Amino acid sequence: TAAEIAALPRQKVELVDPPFVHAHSQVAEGGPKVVEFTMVIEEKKIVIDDAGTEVHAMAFNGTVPGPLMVVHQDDYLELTLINPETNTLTHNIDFHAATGALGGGGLTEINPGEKTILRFKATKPGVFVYHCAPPGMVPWHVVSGMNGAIMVLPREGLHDGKGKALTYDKIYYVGEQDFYVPRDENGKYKKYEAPGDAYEDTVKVMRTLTPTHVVFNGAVGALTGDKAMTAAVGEKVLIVHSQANRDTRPHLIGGHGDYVWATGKFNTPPDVDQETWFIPGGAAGAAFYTFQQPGIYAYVNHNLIEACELGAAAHFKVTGEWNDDLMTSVLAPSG
Amino acid sequence: TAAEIAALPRQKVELVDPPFVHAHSQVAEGGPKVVEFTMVIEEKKIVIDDAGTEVHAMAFNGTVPGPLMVVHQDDYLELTLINPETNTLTHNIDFHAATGALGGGGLTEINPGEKTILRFKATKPGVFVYHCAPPGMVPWHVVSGMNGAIMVLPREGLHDGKGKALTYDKIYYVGEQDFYVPRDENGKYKKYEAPGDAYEDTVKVMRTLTPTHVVFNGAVGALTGDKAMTAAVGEKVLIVHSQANRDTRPHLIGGHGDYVWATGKFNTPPDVDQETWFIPGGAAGAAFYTFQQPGIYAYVNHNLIEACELGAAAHFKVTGEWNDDLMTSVLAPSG
Amino acid sequence: TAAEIAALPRQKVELVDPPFVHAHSQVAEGGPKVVEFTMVIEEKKIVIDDAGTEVHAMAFNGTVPGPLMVVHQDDYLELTLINPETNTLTHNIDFHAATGALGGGGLTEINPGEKTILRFKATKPGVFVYHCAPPGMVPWHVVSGMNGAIMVLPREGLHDGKGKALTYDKIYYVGEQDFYVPRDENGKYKKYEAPGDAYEDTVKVMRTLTPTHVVFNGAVGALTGDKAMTAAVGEKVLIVHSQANRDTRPHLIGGHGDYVWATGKFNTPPDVDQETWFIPGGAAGAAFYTFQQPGIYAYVNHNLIEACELGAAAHFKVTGEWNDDLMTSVLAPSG
Ligand SMILES: [Cu+2]
Ligand SMILES: [Cu+2]
Ligand SMILES: [Cu+2]
Ligand SMILES: [Cu+2]
Ligand SMILES: [Cu+2]
Ligand SMILES: [Cu+2]
What we know:
- 3 copies of one chain form a homotrimer.
- Chain A is mainly β.
- The first copy, chain A, has helices at about 1-5, 140-145, 200-205, 305-310; strands spanning about 10, 35-45, 55-60, 70, 75-85, 95, 115-120, 125-130, 145-155, 170-180, 215, 230, 235-245, 250-255, 255-260, 270-275, 285-290, 295-300, 315-320, 325-335.
- One copper (II) ion sits at the interface of chains C and A.
């Protein structure tokens, strides 16, 4: 009822940049809450590869992907979305988790200099994409990086197909972005003064359905080297993966997805013992794995051209003790 | 036996043009029936976009997609298929729902001026693609629009994964078509005086595996404006979706798939609470949704380039009262 | 322990060429074993189409795909991998079935003239891709044919979703391969006299994400005509299908997938009554079907351009008596 909603507790949360995730509890603390987030939209030039290739990103909270928001089923998510006067374009937000008004898009169209506050009830548990979607320019905003995900945890937290609690020690959010960067006749990537300048050239590339780059966390190598994700043997990790526009097929090289909600929806029982899972464009999925071996793992989109040539590869650096039962080199490489 | 089959009641059905579906009962009335359908194939020029782009379509019942035929499990589907002498090509039909002879393809090869009658037992419940498949010319016929779907309902109607009856108030059939239209050196679509004139140029485009157009009900915007699908708050709608040649990833913008038979087969428990489902090329799927919010919804292939640039977008106009518990604008776009 | 493993029975298994599979028991013979395989890597020219197009194949056991290795859950797979001096490249192996060191890749890097012996515990039941993945050269080896699959059977054989036993009479392994063959200025496929000579040209084609050829068992027609797979009405057949780099959507034309482990993993219950299933790039899947009709069946990737234009089509030739209840030509094609 009116009073019931009015009387619910309100709680502000500080966001953190992907692949890290803000403070949350797996089991819901008490009854339904109105969980409050604020994101400022930033239009800005980003460098997406080691050749200095530039995109005019359109970035929720200044990042590609935008940050993971975490709430529980039947909480309310209340987003203040801010479009500073320094931006050039109108923006909005479509939460796939939400019901009504084009996911919120119809209620959140903000010009530069405007802000809005949207509340919705998170009625369905799962990981879900969100993305900007201005009428008439939807894909251009999405493929300029204006997308992220949220997670709506069951109130009792995660469970396997038998209702046994699944509790992660850490969580990472990998947002995968297909970029479409115009090139000149000499094959060199083009640069533009303002976002709108690139519109016509970019749509032409979009229509080929062939990304120039496919990247995690906004750039080639963003989650490799000193920025590899980490775990220890014995540690239970949840990996949330989203792709707002194009299919992907995540794979943990050297590992598995012990439980994978490939559709991203927690009331759909997870697949198990997965090698390579599939997330369609416009969706998020989640994989749960318990690390068994130390070492460097690669986490990839298993179209290995996309992974190795186009940028869709991350690493995990895992500490701990080798398990010779699971794997051993009986004879090391030799003549 | 032939004698028992001959003793079964016949029902002659009048097909209707997609996205509408001929009158049927969700729960089968009586025992197995021989359900009779007739379709005339029409080779016809169709306009697929607002610019006036033309395709020489090959159209079951004169429409792209072909109409949805509805029977119950263990009914027999008896199709009279006619290839009028005004056509120039040989045609046939492959029913994915059928068992033997290349889905019926082997038994239904008809030249212009010929007809045939094929009967098959609908032994498996689900939605299934049908399409033309003439030896040596299979993809050309299919991507010229010569495909549709059937639905084989369980005799006891639909149920969810857990024995709850699911009874829809209305059903729509969205057929999605990838088209491969040749262009001139100035990037303008080519027209051909005869279907044959288009062939070589079309196979070249087909080889790029990149359609020029991806459309619902035969054309860009075919299911928008005054041809939008309709519903009301509280109404239960089944959306059957097919793609005979190429993957798709349906999404109801502002909604969900409450129950999605993503593989299209009713003995495979549906996924639930879906944001974006996946239907592989050569299959049909179905989603069941109860509308909770009024207004415009877009229904899209959620590669948003395919939706917004290439044509794969439809609308639903939904009447009724707004639910502020589910979503509200706390603060409308403001300075 | 190492001692306990050293004390387990060793079995030497002899590999057979796809699509055939080496002798095995569906239900496990005795307790865990160390199952021993040996494969020599062969770099050779293969001809992949009727125009005499050549690929520099990198072939496990001299075939594309490499052979299917069959073990049971909690057996040990011990592979001796040999890289002869007649080869020019460094190679390794990543088993998606294995846990640690990039699936074995980190421990199996062998130059020509070298060999290695890897052992891993097959802890998860299912069909799983394996492939070469040399640092810095991963997609190039994979798309040159350096991949296959293994099957790790549940010790008690296959069951359906309800633990009812599923026993096949025949098993076939179909390896699907996307090839990226460079062309000259006139659209002719290029030939090279060393694998390395083709590298740069191939990388350029790979980056289009558009294969020039998509084939089964290494070439157009490799599993059609005389080389059709065979079955009889009433026989239960398991069809294993893998694709190491790119999505596929298998379909048995005239048939179905009665049970389909679309993810390839046996602890994930199978989909049923399938028309067309989906296997993401980097994975294997398996379909079980009981033939009910005799004749030619086509088994395809149901992107029909990929099947009929690019080469992704096989045949089954099935003996037996026609079932007129299932399907009958009521009226044969007639004027
Ligand atoms: Cu935007
Ligand atoms: Cu969306
Ligand atoms: Cu036809
Ligand atoms: Cu088909
Ligand atoms: Cu290799
Ligand atoms: Cu791999």
